[PDB]
Structure formats: structure tokens, C-alpha cells
Design a protein around this ligand. Structure first.
Ligand code: HEM
Length: 442
């Protein structure tokens, strides 16, 4: 029959809210999920969602005929600066489908071949910084990964050099970003400089368009010259500023976390590291990698995928009932009702992955085809999936492969994993030492 939905304890008018009084709300929710299982309702003053953790219910929520992408509170707060760019528009806004079409072909093999040499440019700058550290020094891993990915999206997308490696502090653009991400996050939990941060992301916005202003085959080109082959319309003025911001944001934070997590799991798991390093050395025969070589780094790709399994860096997405409906045969839902897919919890479903979901095992991804459908979703779902998926992976495989080719890594502080949440996930304070293998670059 029709079931009552599990819900954690409520506390009068506070609801379930006192159960989330934490800077790490996703990790807290994962704990409630372990307790309560595949589905639980969660209520805060004014708001309600249902959290899903099982592949069996998330397959269902992933049926776009019944459920579309919802803007959670968080994405409503990001909406004041990202706007109706791809990531923070409703599916039914004109501008979503239109930018989708106008920006799609900018992402696959081919677009991705013409992105390559610029990826290698930032990557060699990364290798060089580490080659140049003295003996006394260590690497701040998330910080250097964000310097890389931020610069990679600025160059490949917009031909603009952030020159993040010439800086020993984070880029002005980064320091705004994290605060507002922090905010929107702290914001959710209140039962009651966010001008300085947004006010500041722009200005940079306004600097990349002048540049271009004062020919490139790039995201920015298509944002200026492309027209949606459905309606004929181009992207308008305020929409464009919205897509720039969208991609600099979306296009660097999640990728830097993925690379940070991947290195973290490799230095914690020396047998995996050894095999990942044996492949980088065998595949990467030249001074600098080619496009074809990065495609050959098979196990590096498995490593990355396994880090996305454990800690998918954009760890939750929201959906809503298009109409009145019944979920899993048990849970009726009314038009409008909200679902959040807890992705890390999904990637721990024992019915899918077996009884050792916490182990780091890249060999799980040996034959992707035997992973059920909707068991592995770090790039979201359907027409609202990550547009930059194949960009993110190509860039991360390239960078990881060259890290493992050029250095041996030491976990010198015995780093204990600490996951900071700003929406997205990163291992806060992850540090390492990299001993050079003295191999010449191009
Ligand atoms: C490992 C790296 C990445 C991860 C884990 C990731 C994750 C995701 C997820 C889960 C979504 C869906 C969000 C939702 O349903 O609300 C999304 C959407 C999106 N992502 Fe990514 N992302 C990554 C890399 C990138 C990169 C490099 C870019 C840009 C170059 C990017 C651009 C976008 C955009 C523009 C959307 C909105 C797509 C749409 O609705 O049309 N992602 N991403």
C-alpha cells in the first residue's frame, strides 16, 4: 500500500531544522540517510523536500516526463548573480533551451581537440610551479587545483588569462566566489558583503567582454555569434554576462575538488597510486601529452571516476513533480513537491555497489556498461545533466596523468580528511609534498 514517509524528529515550529546546524549540511544529511534509508522527508520553517539515496527511487526521480530540475534555495540565492544562465534557469525559461542549443556543440571530441593545447598550457604551468618548490616546501592541493581549473576555463572558454600561478594568494575572483557560496549555504539554515562578492564577480565579467571587445573558436564566440536553431534567436545582453559567470563558476570549482579528492585517495592508497603512476609513465611518452594520449589514460580515468563515486563535488541536485504522482509505488506526491538527490549516498547503495562502498577501488569502473542506469550520477541527469562533463574529465585526466608522470607524492602530515562544503565539496587543508622525477617538459 501507500506508506507514511520517514522523517527525522521535528521540534515544534523549528521542524527538523535543529538537526542541520552545521557548516557541513550534506555530510549531516548522509548521516540521517544511513539512519532512515532511501527516502526521508525533511522540513524547515517555510520549506519541505524529500531526500533520496537509493538507486531504485532515483531512477524514478530521473524520469523527466514526471520530474523536472528544481532550483533549490541555494540556486535561488546564486540566481542574483548567475541569473538565467544554464545552471540557474528553469527548464521552461526561453533562455535555458536556447543557450543549451547555442552552447552544446562547444563540448565533445572536436571542440575538445581545439581545447587541448590550451589545457596543456595551464597544466605545464602547474608542473613547473611544483618542479620549482625548494626542499623545505609542500603543495596546497585545492588551492593549486583551483588556480589550474580557473585558468583553464578562462583560456579555453574566453581567451582570458587569469594568470593565477603568478599569485600566491587566491585570485580576486575566487575570494568573492567562495564567500557567496559560503553565504547562500549559511543562509539556508537561518529561521529569521553579499554586495561586495557579487559586485566583484561582475567587474571581472565586464573585463572579459572588453578584452574580446578591444577570431577565436570558443564558448565566448558562440555566446556572441550563435543563434538557436529552433527559434532563430541569439543570446541577448544580460543573458550573456550570465553565461560567463555560470561557466567560470561551474567550470572550475567541481573540477578542482575532483582533482583534490583524486590525489587524496591515491596518497591514502599506495597500491592504486603505483598502478596509476605505471600507466602515466607508459602512456605519456612525449614531453607534453597529446589529445590521443589522454584518451589512452584508462586507469587514470577509473581513478577519477572512483573519486566522483565517493565524493561527487556537486553532491546534490533538486527536482520537482511536474504533476500529481506516485513515487516508488508508495509515496504520493503533489504537483510542485521537491526531491533532492543525495548523490554521495546514492554512490553508497549496497544493492548496487556491494558491501565495501567506502573503499577506494578504481577497478570498479573496469566495464562501465555493467553499472546499472542511474547508479552513478556525479554529472546530474537528463537534459539538465552537466554540459561540461567531457571538458572536466579531459582536463582532470590530462592533469592527473602529468602529475603522476612527473612526481612522487608524499602524505607528509598524515592528512585527515576534512570536507568543506560551499554547496560544492573540497578536502580542506589537503597538503602534500611532491618529489620531482626529473623528467623534462616540452
Ligand atoms: C567533475 C567536474 C564536474 C562535476 C562533478 C559537475 C557537476 C554538475 C552537476 C551535478 C550538474 C547538475 C546540477 C543540477 O541538476 O542542479 C551540472 C550542471 C552544469 N554544469 Fe557541471 N560539473 C563538473 C564540471 C563542469 C564544467 C568544467 C563545466 C563548464 C565548462 C560545467 C558546467 C555546467 C553547466 C553550465 C551546468 C548546467 C547545465 C544545464 O542545465 O544546461 N560542469 N554540473
Amino acid at each position: 500500500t501507500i506508506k507514511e514517509m520517514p522523517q527525522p524528529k521535528t521540534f515544534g515550529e523549528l521542524k527538523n531544522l535543529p538537526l542541520l546546524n552545521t557548516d557541513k549540511p550534506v555530510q549531516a544529511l548522509m548521516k540521517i540517510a544511513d539512519e532512515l534509508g532511501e527516502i526521508f522527508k525533511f522540513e524547515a520553517p517555510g520549506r519541505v523536500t524529500r531526500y533520496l539515496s537509493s538507486q531504485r527511487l532515483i531512477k524514478e526521480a530521473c524520469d523527466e516526463s514526471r520530474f523536472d530540475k528544481n532550483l533549490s534555495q541555494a540556486l535561488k540565492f546564486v540566481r542574483d548573480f548567475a541569473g538565467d544562465g544554464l545552471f540557474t534557469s528553469w527548464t521552461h525559461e526561453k533562455n535555458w533551451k536556447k543557450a543549451h542549443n547555442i552552447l552544446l556543440p562547444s563540448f565533445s571530441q572536436q571542440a575538445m581537440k581545439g581545447y587541448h593545447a590550451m589545457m596543456v598550457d595551464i597544466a605545464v604551468q602547474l608542473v613547473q610551479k611544483w618542479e620549482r618548490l625548494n626542499a623545505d616546501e609542500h603543495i596546497e592541493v585545492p588551492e593549486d587545483m583551483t588556480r589550474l581549473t580557473l585558468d583553464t576555463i578562462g583560456l579555453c572558454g574566453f581567451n582570458y588569462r587569469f594568470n593565477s600561478f603568478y599569485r600566491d594568494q587566491p585570485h580576486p575572483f575566487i575570494t568573492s566566489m567562495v564567500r557567496a557560496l559560503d553565504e547562500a549555504m549559511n543562509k539556508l539554515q537561518r529561521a529569521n558583503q553579499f554586495q561586495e562578492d557579487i559586485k566583484v564577480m561582475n567587474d571581472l565579467v565586464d573585463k572579459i567582454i572588453a578584452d574580446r571587445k578591444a577570431q577565436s573558436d570558443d564558448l565566448l564566440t558562440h555566446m556572441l555569434n550563435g543563434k538557436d536553431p529552433e527559434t532563430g534567436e541569439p543570446l541577448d545582453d544580460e543573458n550573456i554576462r550570465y553565461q560567463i559567470i555560470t561557466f567560470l563558476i561551474c567550470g572550475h570549482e567541481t573540477t578542482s575538488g575532483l582533482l583534490s579528492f583524486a590525489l587524496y585517495f591515491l596518497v591514502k592508497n599506495p597500491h592504486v597510486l603505483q598502478k596509476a603512476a605505471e600507466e602515466a609513465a607508459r602512456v605519456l611518452v612525449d614531453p607534453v601529452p597529446s589529445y590521443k594520449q589522454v584518451k589512452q589514460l584508462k586507469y587514470v580515468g577509473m581513478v577519477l571516476n572512483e573519486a566522483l563515486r565517493l565524493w561527487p563535488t556537486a553532491p546534490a541536485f533538486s527536482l520537482y513533480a511536474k504533476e500529481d504522482t506516485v513515487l516508488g509505488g508508495e509515496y504520493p506526491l503533489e504537483k510542485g513537491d521537491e526531491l533532492m538527490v543525495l548523490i554521495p549516498q546514492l554512490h553508497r547503495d549496497k544493492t548496487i555497489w556491494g558491501d565495501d562502498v567506502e573503499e577506494f577501488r578504481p577497478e570498479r569502473f573496469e566495464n562501465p556498461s555493467a553499472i546499472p542506469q542511474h547508479a552513478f550520477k556525479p554529472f546530474g541527469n537528463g537534459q539538465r545533466a552537466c554540459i561540461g562533463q567531457q571538458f572536466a574529465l579531459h582536463e582532470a585526466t590530462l592533469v592527473l596523468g602529468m602529475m603522476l608522470k612527473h612526481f612522487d607524492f608524499e602524505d607528509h602530515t598524515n592528512y585527515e580528511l576534512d570536507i568543506k562544503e560551499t554547496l560544492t565539496l573540497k578536502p580542506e587543508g589537503f597538503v602534500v609534498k611532491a618529489k620531482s622525477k626529473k623528467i623534462p617538459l616540452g
